[PDB]
Design a protein around this ligand. Structure first.
Ligand SMILES: [Mg+2]
Ligand SMILES: [Mg+2]
Ligand SMILES: [Mg+2]
Ligand SMILES: [Mg+2]
Length: 114
RNA sequence: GUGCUCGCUUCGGCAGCACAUAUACUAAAAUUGGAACGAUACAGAGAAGAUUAGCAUGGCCCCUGCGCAAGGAUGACACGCAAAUUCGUGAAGCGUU
């Protein structure tokens, strides 16, 4: 059995959050060594190109593949859509604001003047 | 067309020589399209409770002026989610290995 934890911190740079998300997505993927070997026995030495070494024009993908990336796109898009968790419209406390822009400005002022 | 051939050669012509060397958006048209700040009618003036001065910024907006001056309502126009890359706790319940 296995165990780990990862706590959230400051967004410090957009890079940090991006990196966390990449970690998760990367861990998810599971590759088929079948297709890997199939692709391998055709091309051989072309498999291991340096930045500058080797070249074959284009690798054309079966559509079924393309569907995988499209699906992952939609998933990540949703997960990103949920970035900001909204606090429910609570009327219970005292109202001094005149509109929602004013309500939010009063909230930002509450953070900076204690 | 002009003159001269000592040309025929009459005074008729013809010839020869010289001299002279290329205009033009071809149109009296026929077209074809857009404006007059004119009517017509609507329309109808920044800021802050009210009444009002203005100087700017921006640009597929101009107008009067010789203008790099000045003026034109401060010349006009310039506001409904002006939301952008990207999350995670704490508890509970349910179903699963
Ligand atoms: Mg006023
Ligand atoms: Mg002016
Ligand atoms: Mg005035
Ligand atoms: Mg102005």
């Amino acid at each position: 059995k296995k165990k780990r934890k990862n706590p959230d911190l400051g967004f410090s740079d957009y890079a940090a959050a991006q990196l966390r998300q990449y970690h998760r997505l990367t861990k998810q993927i599971k590759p088929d060594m079948e297709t890997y070997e199939r692709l391998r026995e055709k091309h051989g030495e072309e498999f291991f190109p340096t930045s500058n070494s080797l070249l074959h024009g284009t690798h054309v993908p079966s559509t079924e593949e393309i569907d995988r990336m499209v699906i992952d796109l939609e998933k990540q898009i949703e997960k990103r859509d949920k970035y900001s968790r909204r606090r429910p419209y609570n009327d219970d406390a005292d109202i001094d604001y005149i509109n929602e822009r004013n309500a939010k400005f009063n909230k930002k002022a509450e953070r900076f003047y204690g």
